[PDB]
Design an enzyme around this catalytic site. Sequence first.
Site, mmCIF file in Angstrom:
data_model
loop_
_atom_site.group_PDB
_atom_site.id
_atom_site.type_symbol
_atom_site.label_atom_id
_atom_site.label_comp_id
_atom_site.label_asym_id
_atom_site.label_seq_id
_atom_site.Cartn_x
_atom_site.Cartn_y
_atom_site.Cartn_z
ATOM 1 C CG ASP A 167 2.321 -12.459 8.675
ATOM 2 O OD1 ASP A 167 2.673 -11.256 8.806
ATOM 3 O OD2 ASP A 167 2.306 -13.169 9.697
ATOM 4 N NE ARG A 195 10.920 2.265 10.022
ATOM 5 C CZ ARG A 195 9.908 1.783 9.313
ATOM 6 N NH1 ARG A 195 10.129 0.865 8.367
ATOM 7 N NH2 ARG A 195 8.663 2.187 9.573
ATOM 8 C CG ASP A 197 8.536 -2.339 7.654
ATOM 9 O OD1 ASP A 197 8.039 -1.199 7.757
ATOM 10 O OD2 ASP A 197 7.922 -3.237 7.024
ATOM 11 C CG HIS A 201 2.079 -5.876 11.728
ATOM 12 N ND1 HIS A 201 0.710 -6.001 11.773
ATOM 13 C CD2 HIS A 201 2.339 -4.543 11.738
ATOM 14 C CE1 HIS A 201 0.161 -4.799 11.728
ATOM 15 N NE2 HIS A 201 1.129 -3.897 11.712
ATOM 16 C CD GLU A 233 6.203 1.157 11.454
ATOM 17 O OE1 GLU A 233 6.196 -0.076 11.198
ATOM 18 O OE2 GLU A 233 5.474 1.965 10.851
ATOM 19 C CG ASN A 298 7.051 7.877 9.856
ATOM 20 O OD1 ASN A 298 6.021 8.423 9.458
ATOM 21 N ND2 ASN A 298 7.107 6.568 10.153
ATOM 22 N NE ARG A 337 12.969 8.370 11.784
ATOM 23 C CZ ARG A 337 12.157 7.292 11.890
ATOM 24 N NH1 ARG A 337 12.622 6.047 11.723
ATOM 25 N NH2 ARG A 337 10.875 7.463 12.132
HETATM 26 C C1 LIG Z 1 1.693 1.939 7.229
HETATM 27 C C2 LIG Z 1 1.661 1.340 8.630
HETATM 28 O O1 LIG Z 1 0.458 0.535 8.750
HETATM 29 C C3 LIG Z 1 0.269 -0.021 10.072
HETATM 30 O O2 LIG Z 1 -0.097 0.917 10.960
HETATM 31 C C4 LIG Z 1 -1.358 0.960 11.595
HETATM 32 C C5 LIG Z 1 -1.150 1.118 13.096
HETATM 33 O O3 LIG Z 1 -0.385 0.050 13.605
HETATM 34 C C6 LIG Z 1 -2.521 1.187 13.783
HETATM 35 O O4 LIG Z 1 -2.366 1.350 15.172
HETATM 36 C C7 LIG Z 1 -3.395 2.294 13.175
HETATM 37 O O5 LIG Z 1 -2.815 3.549 13.394
HETATM 38 O O6 LIG Z 1 -3.481 2.116 11.772
HETATM 39 C C8 LIG Z 1 -2.211 2.142 11.116
HETATM 40 C C9 LIG Z 1 -2.434 2.170 9.614
HETATM 41 O O7 LIG Z 1 -3.176 1.012 9.270
HETATM 42 C C10 LIG Z 1 1.460 -0.854 10.549
HETATM 43 O O8 LIG Z 1 1.246 -1.242 11.905
HETATM 44 C C11 LIG Z 1 2.797 -0.112 10.338
HETATM 45 O O9 LIG Z 1 3.884 -1.008 10.544
HETATM 46 C C12 LIG Z 1 2.888 0.454 8.912
HETATM 47 N N1 LIG Z 1 4.199 1.092 8.638
HETATM 48 C C13 LIG Z 1 5.149 0.436 8.012
HETATM 49 C C14 LIG Z 1 4.942 -0.949 7.379
HETATM 50 C C15 LIG Z 1 4.811 -1.106 6.044
HETATM 51 C C16 LIG Z 1 4.676 -2.511 5.469
HETATM 52 O O10 LIG Z 1 6.040 -2.868 5.168
HETATM 53 C C17 LIG Z 1 4.918 0.037 5.052
HETATM 54 O O11 LIG Z 1 3.719 0.140 4.285
HETATM 55 C C18 LIG Z 1 3.691 0.724 3.094
HETATM 56 O O12 LIG Z 1 3.948 -0.305 2.130
HETATM 57 C C19 LIG Z 1 2.868 -1.187 1.870
HETATM 58 C C20 LIG Z 1 3.332 -2.318 0.926
HETATM 59 O O13 LIG Z 1 3.774 -1.889 -0.342
HETATM 60 C C21 LIG Z 1 1.685 -0.358 1.340
HETATM 61 O O14 LIG Z 1 0.588 -1.180 0.951
HETATM 62 C C22 LIG Z 1 0.331 -1.222 -0.374
HETATM 63 O O15 LIG Z 1 0.431 -2.597 -0.787
HETATM 64 C C23 LIG Z 1 -0.601 -3.464 -0.266
HETATM 65 C C24 LIG Z 1 -0.370 -4.895 -0.769
HETATM 66 C C25 LIG Z 1 -1.990 -2.927 -0.657
HETATM 67 N N2 LIG Z 1 -3.043 -3.744 -0.054
HETATM 68 C C26 LIG Z 1 -4.029 -3.980 -0.823
HETATM 69 C C27 LIG Z 1 -4.056 -5.354 -1.455
HETATM 70 C C28 LIG Z 1 -4.958 -6.299 -1.104
HETATM 71 C C29 LIG Z 1 -4.881 -7.634 -1.816
HETATM 72 O O16 LIG Z 1 -5.263 -8.679 -0.934
HETATM 73 C C30 LIG Z 1 -6.028 -6.067 -0.062
HETATM 74 O O17 LIG Z 1 -5.947 -7.057 0.955
HETATM 75 C C31 LIG Z 1 -5.869 -4.716 0.618
HETATM 76 O O18 LIG Z 1 -7.057 -4.374 1.311
HETATM 77 C C32 LIG Z 1 -5.461 -3.659 -0.408
HETATM 78 O O19 LIG Z 1 -5.573 -2.339 0.111
HETATM 79 C C33 LIG Z 1 -2.134 -1.460 -0.214
HETATM 80 O O20 LIG Z 1 -3.397 -0.911 -0.552
HETATM 81 C C34 LIG Z 1 -1.001 -0.610 -0.810
HETATM 82 O O21 LIG Z 1 -1.032 0.723 -0.312
HETATM 83 C C35 LIG Z 1 1.258 0.641 2.417
HETATM 84 O O22 LIG Z 1 0.164 1.412 1.958
HETATM 85 C C36 LIG Z 1 2.442 1.556 2.775
HETATM 86 O O23 LIG Z 1 2.100 2.366 3.887
HETATM 87 C C37 LIG Z 1 5.242 1.372 5.760
HETATM 88 O O24 LIG Z 1 5.892 2.296 4.895
HETATM 89 C C38 LIG Z 1 6.091 1.106 7.003
HETATM 90 O O25 LIG Z 1 6.625 2.316 7.523
HETATM 91 CA CA LIG Z 2 3.378 -11.177 11.107
HETATM 92 CL CL LIG Z 3 9.622 4.716 11.436
#
Ligand SMILES: C[C@H]1O[C@H](O[C@H]2[C@H](O)[C@@H](O)[C@@H](O)O[C@@H]2CO)[C@H](O)[C@@H](O)[C@@H]1N[C@H]1C=C(CO)[C@@H](O[C@H]2O[C@H](CO)[C@@H](O[C@H]3O[C@H](C)[C@@H](N[C@H]4C=C(CO)[C@@H](O)[C@H](O)[C@H]4O)[C@H](O)[C@H]3O)[C@H](O)[C@H]2O)[C@H](O)[C@H]1O
Ligand SMILES: [Ca+2]
Ligand SMILES: [Cl-]
Length: 496
Positions: A167, A195, A197, A201, A233, A298, A337
């Site tokens: 972060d 957009r 992202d 957060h 977003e 999306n 969009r």
């Molecule tokens: C995907 C969205 O998540 C959030 O949304 C929340 C809502 O805000 C909330 O109200 C409610 O509805 O729940 C939702 C889902 O939880 C967020 O607020 C929103 O911005 C997100 N959309 C965004 C943002 C991102 C981040 O840039 C995009 O996310 C996608 O990319 C991620 C990164 O590659 C991906 O995650 C993957 O990688 C991480 C590192 C991994 N985490 C694991 C690792 C560790 C190690 O410490 C552990 O801590 C974790 O518990 C592990 O699970 C993930 O497992 C892996 O998938 C993510 O899945 C993917 O969606 C997204 O595309 C944007 O549009």
């Molecule tokens: Ca932050």
């Molecule tokens: Cl979006």
Amino acid sequence: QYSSNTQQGRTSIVHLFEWRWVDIALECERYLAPKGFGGVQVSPPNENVAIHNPFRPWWERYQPVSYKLCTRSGNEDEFRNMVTRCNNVGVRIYVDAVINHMCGNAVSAGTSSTCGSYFNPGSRDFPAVPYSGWDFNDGKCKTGSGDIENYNDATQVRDCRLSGLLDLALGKDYVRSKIAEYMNHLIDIGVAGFRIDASKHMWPGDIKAILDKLHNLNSNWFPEGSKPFIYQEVIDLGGEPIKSSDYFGNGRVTEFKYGAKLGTVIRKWNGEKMSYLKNWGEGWGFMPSDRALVFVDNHDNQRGHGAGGASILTFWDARLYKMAVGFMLAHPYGFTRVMSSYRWPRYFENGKDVNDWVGPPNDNGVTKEVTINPDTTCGNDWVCEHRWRQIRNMVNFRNVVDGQPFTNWYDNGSNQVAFGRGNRGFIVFNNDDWTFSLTLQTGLPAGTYCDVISGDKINGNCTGIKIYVSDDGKAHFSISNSAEDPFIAIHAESKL
Ligand SMILES: C[C@H]1O[C@H](O[C@H]2[C@H](O)[C@@H](O)[C@@H](O)O[C@@H]2CO)[C@H](O)[C@@H](O)[C@@H]1N[C@H]1C=C(CO)[C@@H](O[C@H]2O[C@H](CO)[C@@H](O[C@H]3O[C@H](C)[C@@H](N[C@H]4C=C(CO)[C@@H](O)[C@H](O)[C@H]4O)[C@H](O)[C@H]3O)[C@H](O)[C@H]2O)[C@H](O)[C@H]1O
Ligand SMILES: [Ca+2]
Ligand SMILES: [Cl-]
Ligand SMILES: C[C@H]1O[C@H](O[C@H]2[C@H](O)[C@@H](O)[C@@H](O[C@H]3[C@H](O)[C@@H](O)[C@H](O)O[C@@H]3CO)O[C@@H]2CO)[C@H](O)[C@@H](O)[C@@H]1N
């Protein structure tokens, strides 16, 4: 930050999810410009972690390594070539800016990245930027895990690691400046906006501090004093302390309520009916139309990520999807969009798609080009929803009726509805289990109109259905409930 900066008369953006820069450049010239598309949302253009477990997922692009413009979509020269060629034909580029975070805390150190930059998540060293341990929120976050654990606490949502994503310390001027440098690089190339992202957060005030540092848009293509279009977003479905309105000072905000509710309506779930759409928009509890960035699906929710939702409609449910997208593009609410997707081998094990990670069509990690089939569809497993006649023609409908009032609403109390946009367009839907056959006031000049859903206007005739508007503005419509596309749309530019 509120104005799209599109050409006058162009009113939508299309997300060309994971497309290569060279393919987008051609697409602008050969398709988007002549078809009247406003602009293109691109996948993150900055260097990311190359993740091989699982194999090159689409989501690796949301794990930044640096701000070098070097990804599976292409290099800096290819990116610059695309922006120039697109702007030159009046089609804008909007960048998916991943600025809340760098990569996952558990990724291995080394050079497994799309431009081969070195990075060490463990020691928090991203020397290509450069960032160090001083540039992250590790000491600010107050959770035991260091990750976001609880969305009811607005502080940890902003200060802690989203799913372990390192972060960035966005309260620091140094961090804000490195992000602004990246975004100004993009603006000066000729990008029309962003957009943002993961906006939820970040503190609205930190985004504001970053935005303060941004240039005006490139003065070759944009009038002096033009500001980047910002859409943030923020998934706000209600029930959380953070609200989408918290972000109105920075620009538009994604309205995730829109597609969730429309999906339920069009599937006829939860007792919902198209007749209820008469007060679509603010009447449904949505944010102000002048701030909403709207969409049916999306890149996240079409594959069950983000808020997901069973009701979300996608290309997988093509029939209902076209109707939802058609409704959205017809209705004045929000800035639209359109999604453009690829197919992946969707496989459900206990209600969840285990292949929801699969990246773009590829051969050994190299992204496949978008090939254009003889019928103007796409090959190589690209879906190209934006080239589907029904959606492409509705993109032009929205342009034709731009600024005209919602008028001449009809409904049968169930799922047969119609409405006009001033005197410029009219659209009719049948989502009931019987035929719609009725004469309706259209609000349009007398004439013969090509139905732009079933066909096209081509030099004095129509390839699909023709609608005949009499001198008093009335026209008969017949739509069977078995219709492959149970809706009809006509407008001023489809008149013979
Ligand atoms: C995907 C969205 O998540 C959030 O949304 C929340 C809502 O805000 C909330 O109200 C409610 O509805 O729940 C939702 C889902 O939880 C967020 O607020 C929103 O911005 C997100 N959309 C965004 C943002 C991102 C981040 O840039 C995009 O996310 C996608 O990319 C991620 C990164 O590659 C991906 O995650 C993957 O990688 C991480 C590192 C991994 N985490 C694991 C690792 C560790 C190690 O410490 C552990 O801590 C974790 O518990 C592990 O699970 C993930 O497992 C892996 O998938 C993510 O899945 C993917 O969606 C997204 O595309 C944007 O549009
Ligand atoms: Ca932050
Ligand atoms: Cl979006
Ligand atoms: C503000 C409110 O907006 C949404 O509510 C919808 C509702 O989901 C939908 O079924 C429909 O509800 C009424 C309608 O208002 C009324 O005209 C009609 O006769 O009866 C319908 C129900 O049978 O429309 C409303 C919006 O008017 C959101 O879904 C909801 O969460 C939110 N509180």
